[PDB]
Design an enzyme around this catalytic site. Structure first.
Site, PDB file in Angstrom:
ATOM      1  N   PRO A   1       0.828  -1.209   0.000  1.00  0.00           N
ATOM      2  CA  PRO A   1       0.000   0.000   0.000  1.00  0.00           C
ATOM      3  C   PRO A   1       0.867   1.266   0.000  1.00  0.00           C
ATOM      4  O   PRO A   1       0.358   2.385  -0.082  1.00  0.00           O
ATOM      5  CB  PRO A   1      -0.828  -0.156   1.272  1.00  0.00           C
ATOM      6  CG  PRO A   1       0.132  -0.877   2.205  1.00  0.00           C
ATOM      7  CD  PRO A   1       0.760  -1.910   1.299  1.00  0.00           C
TER       8      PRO A   1
ATOM      9  N   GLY B   1       2.762 -10.112   0.396  1.00  0.00           N
ATOM     10  CA  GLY B   1       3.037 -10.090   1.818  1.00  0.00           C
ATOM     11  C   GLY B   1       1.827 -10.495   2.644  1.00  0.00           C
ATOM     12  O   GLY B   1       0.702 -10.597   2.145  1.00  0.00           O
TER      13      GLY B   1
ATOM     14  N   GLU C   1       2.196  -8.044   9.031  1.00  0.00           N
ATOM     15  CA  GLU C   1       2.614  -6.648   8.983  1.00  0.00           C
ATOM     16  C   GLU C   1       3.412  -6.313   7.740  1.00  0.00           C
ATOM     17  O   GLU C   1       3.609  -5.141   7.425  1.00  0.00           O
ATOM     18  CB  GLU C   1       3.451  -6.299  10.217  1.00  0.00           C
ATOM     19  CG  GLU C   1       2.919  -5.116  10.991  1.00  0.00           C
ATOM     20  CD  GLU C   1       1.517  -5.368  11.511  1.00  0.00           C
ATOM     21  OE1 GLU C   1       1.339  -6.365  12.248  1.00  0.00           O
ATOM     22  OE2 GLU C   1       0.600  -4.582  11.184  1.00  0.00           O
TER      23      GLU C   1
ATOM     24  N   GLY D   1      -4.322   0.775  -4.341  1.00  0.00           N
ATOM     25  CA  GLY D   1      -5.156   1.844  -3.807  1.00  0.00           C
ATOM     26  C   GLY D   1      -4.808   2.218  -2.380  1.00  0.00           C
ATOM     27  O   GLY D   1      -4.104   1.469  -1.694  1.00  0.00           O
TER      28      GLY D   1
ATOM     29  N   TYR E   1      -5.713   1.929   0.716  1.00  0.00           N
ATOM     30  CA  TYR E   1      -6.474   1.182   1.696  1.00  0.00           C
ATOM     31  C   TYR E   1      -5.640  -0.047   2.006  1.00  0.00           C
ATOM     32  O   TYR E   1      -4.773  -0.423   1.216  1.00  0.00           O
ATOM     33  CB  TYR E   1      -7.861   0.813   1.134  1.00  0.00           C
ATOM     34  CG  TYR E   1      -7.862   0.368  -0.315  1.00  0.00           C
ATOM     35  CD1 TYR E   1      -7.540  -0.938  -0.658  1.00  0.00           C
ATOM     36  CD2 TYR E   1      -8.197   1.259  -1.345  1.00  0.00           C
ATOM     37  CE1 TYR E   1      -7.554  -1.365  -1.982  1.00  0.00           C
ATOM     38  CE2 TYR E   1      -8.216   0.838  -2.693  1.00  0.00           C
ATOM     39  CZ  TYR E   1      -7.893  -0.481  -2.997  1.00  0.00           C
ATOM     40  OH  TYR E   1      -7.914  -0.941  -4.295  1.00  0.00           O
TER      41      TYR E   1
ATOM     42  N   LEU F   1      -5.283  -4.142   2.915  1.00  0.00           N
ATOM     43  CA  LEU F   1      -5.861  -5.480   2.816  1.00  0.00           C
ATOM     44  C   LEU F   1      -5.040  -6.446   3.685  1.00  0.00           C
ATOM     45  O   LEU F   1      -3.965  -6.095   4.178  1.00  0.00           O
ATOM     46  CB  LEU F   1      -5.856  -5.959   1.357  1.00  0.00           C
ATOM     47  CG  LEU F   1      -6.577  -5.058   0.339  1.00  0.00           C
ATOM     48  CD1 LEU F   1      -6.573  -5.710  -1.041  1.00  0.00           C
ATOM     49  CD2 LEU F   1      -8.013  -4.809   0.794  1.00  0.00           C
TER      50      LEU F   1
HETATM   51  N1  LIG Z   1      -3.305  -1.427  -0.936  1.00  0.00           N
HETATM   52  C1  LIG Z   1      -2.620  -2.550  -1.140  1.00  0.00           C
HETATM   53  N2  LIG Z   1      -1.866  -2.725  -2.282  1.00  0.00           N
HETATM   54  C2  LIG Z   1      -0.955  -3.729  -2.438  1.00  0.00           C
HETATM   55  N3  LIG Z   1      -0.623  -4.591  -1.420  1.00  0.00           N
HETATM   56  C3  LIG Z   1      -1.337  -4.403  -0.271  1.00  0.00           C
HETATM   57  C4  LIG Z   1      -2.314  -3.455  -0.065  1.00  0.00           C
HETATM   58  N4  LIG Z   1      -2.868  -3.573   1.233  1.00  0.00           N
HETATM   59  C5  LIG Z   1      -2.220  -4.566   1.747  1.00  0.00           C
HETATM   60  N5  LIG Z   1      -1.233  -5.129   0.952  1.00  0.00           N
HETATM   61  C6  LIG Z   1      -0.531  -6.255   1.044  1.00  0.00           C
HETATM   62  O1  LIG Z   1      -0.929  -7.100   2.192  1.00  0.00           O
HETATM   63  C7  LIG Z   1       0.107  -7.179   3.164  1.00  0.00           C
HETATM   64  C8  LIG Z   1      -0.546  -7.190   4.609  1.00  0.00           C
HETATM   65  S1  LIG Z   1      -1.003  -5.574   5.099  1.00  0.00           S
HETATM   66  C9  LIG Z   1       0.457  -4.963   6.048  1.00  0.00           C
HETATM   67  C10 LIG Z   1       0.749  -3.571   5.529  1.00  0.00           C
HETATM   68  C11 LIG Z   1       1.896  -2.787   6.086  1.00  0.00           C
HETATM   69  N6  LIG Z   1       2.071  -2.708   7.599  1.00  0.00           N
HETATM   70  C12 LIG Z   1       1.819  -1.294   5.576  1.00  0.00           C
HETATM   71  O2  LIG Z   1       1.143  -0.468   6.218  1.00  0.00           O
HETATM   72  O3  LIG Z   1       2.663  -0.984   4.651  1.00  0.00           O
HETATM   73  C13 LIG Z   1       1.173  -6.200   2.809  1.00  0.00           C
HETATM   74  O4  LIG Z   1       2.435  -6.728   3.182  1.00  0.00           O
HETATM   75  C14 LIG Z   1       0.994  -6.147   1.254  1.00  0.00           C
HETATM   76  O5  LIG Z   1       1.733  -7.187   0.607  1.00  0.00           O
END
Ligand SMILES: Nc1ncnc2c1ncn2[C@@H]1O[C@H](CSCC[C@H](N)C(=O)O)[C@@H](O)[C@H]1O
Ligand SMILES: Nc1ncnc2c1ncn2[C@@H]1O[C@H](CSCC[C@H](N)C(=O)O)[C@@H](O)[C@H]1O
Lengths: 250, 250
Positions: free
Chosen positions: A91, A115, A118, A136, A138, A140
């Site tokens: 993200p 991923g 975290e 985007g 947001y 996931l």
């Molecule tokens: N908007 C999005 N776009 C692409 N990957 C996303 C995403 N939201 C979550 N992820 C994916 O899902 C994983 C779990 S979410 C962990 C997110 C991290 N602490 C942050 O704030 O940067 C992330 O490692 C990533 O691979």
């Protein structure tokens, strides 16, 4: 075949969502798109196949375990041969958009790192990733859906993928798509714009471009400001706005 | 149970991607999230179960057939009882973002309509949809992935869904997340910031907030301009920028 996509994910089966259904499933089944997965779990050495680990400095959450993840990525790179662009779904990466889609579509080989938890160690990103991409603003639970979103988007560009059911869709020319109608003639008391029933090819063309322009103007004005319209587009936009300013609204 | 989601889709099985894997699969398996699907194909009356139709005014592409799609939606609404917000997944809808996610998370009942082909009749949208949502400025083959993206995003808010592996993630407080590290101590010649090894809880806290601020400043400056920082945040942002302006860069 035209595009090979290597995937690193702890949930390989999720990808059947795109490999076994619709046009993407078709593209895979016909070898226009190749999707291979490697699960970090398969690279664990401990009795319990631990794929997560505690972050230094602690805090809430866990990180993906480095060794299993790194080995999966290396194995994926080994199969990719040379020329594969390694992408980490995040993200915090470049926010995806049609332009980015077409850019990504130029690659013949991709490796998408998904991923979980975290996320992953920042050093891995600096040493194994070429680019970071987000679908985007947001968050996931994992990179799987975003990875599939990316694959589905670039697959629409592989020749032979789309059929009679693409160049008219939103953002294609920078503009939103126009409305569309089908049977019945009357739906819930609502009729189809007469021009779409008239059979006047040229008139229908202008009606669609006008609607495409009006809708972009009304919903995504910033997009218009960014685009450089042709003479005809500037004329149809004027007409669309004039028509809109001629009617009552809610 | 906390959230019921009704889905209209021609490819119901794609949703197993979220209902059978990871935390979302867990949430479904434990009845914290309910996902029911209705396939328009099951509402067809012709021998060949036709779910598409020609758009008036012709043009390239096909539209989803109205009757099958409308019947599926009505059936879904019948099961939803009252209070369900009907959402159409579309690249022309409100672009999704964390704020939108939390907003959507307030609903106890949702119905997500997934399109295919060129989309659906505009009158259906005016008569059956409450809101239109997009997951980004790019075009996909169907509304399934976007629908799953939406579900996964709002599921993170249902109590009991997330575990020890959320409030620190990007956009949570409007800021990007900070970097994170785990074993080994040295990775590809790269070490972990000493402070994360020092065990100084308060220092580690500031390091993380500082990094969160610096990364937002460097990658998504527009976000900062939008947020109203607290005194501490304004102080840590100053320090993060000052530290950055003190080093050489590539
Ligand atoms: N908007 C999005 N776009 C692409 N990957 C996303 C995403 N939201 C979550 N992820 C994916 O899902 C994983 C779990 S979410 C962990 C997110 C991290 N602490 C942050 O704030 O940067 C992330 O490692 C990533 O691979
Ligand atoms: N960015 C995105 N967000 C949400 N839904 C999307 C989407 N991209 C594609 N879709 C979904 O997939 C379907 C096939 S794409 C057809 C899109 C349409 N002509 C347009 O330009 O508006 C759409 O009906 C929609 O349900």
């Amino acid at each position: 075949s035209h595009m090979w996509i290597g995937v690193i994910s702890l949930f390989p089966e999720m990808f059947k969502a795109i490999t076994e259904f619709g046009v993407t499933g078709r593209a895979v089944k016909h070898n226009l798109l190749k999707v291979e997965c490697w699960n970090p779990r398969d690279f664990t050495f401990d009795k319990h196949k631990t794929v997560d680990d505690r972050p230094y400095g602690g805090g809430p959450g866990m990180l993906m375990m480095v060794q299993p993840l790194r080995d999966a990525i290396h194995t994926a790179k080994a199969a990719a041969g040379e020329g594969a662009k390694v992408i980490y779904l995040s993200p915090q990466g470049r926010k995806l958009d049609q332009g980015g889609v077409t850019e990504l579509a130029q690659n013949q080989k991709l490796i998408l790192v998904c991923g979980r938890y975290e996320g992953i160690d920042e050093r891995l990103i600096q040493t194994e990733i070429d680019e970071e991409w987000s679908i985007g603003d947001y968050v996931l639970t994992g990179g799987e859906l975003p990875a599939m979103t990316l694959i589905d988007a670039v697959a629409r560009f592989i020749p032979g993928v789309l059929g009679k059911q693409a160049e008219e869709d939103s953002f294609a020319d920078g503009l939103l798509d126009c409305p569309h109608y089908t049977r019945p003639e009357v739906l819930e008391g609502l009729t189809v714009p007469p021009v779409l029933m008239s059979g006047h090819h040229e008139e229908i063309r202008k009606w669609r471009l006008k609607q495409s322009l009006q809708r972009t103007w009304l919903r995504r004005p910033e997009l218009l400001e960014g685009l450089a319209l042709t003479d005809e587009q500037r004329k149809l936009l004027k007409e669309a706005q004039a028509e809109h300013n001629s009617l009552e609204h809610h």
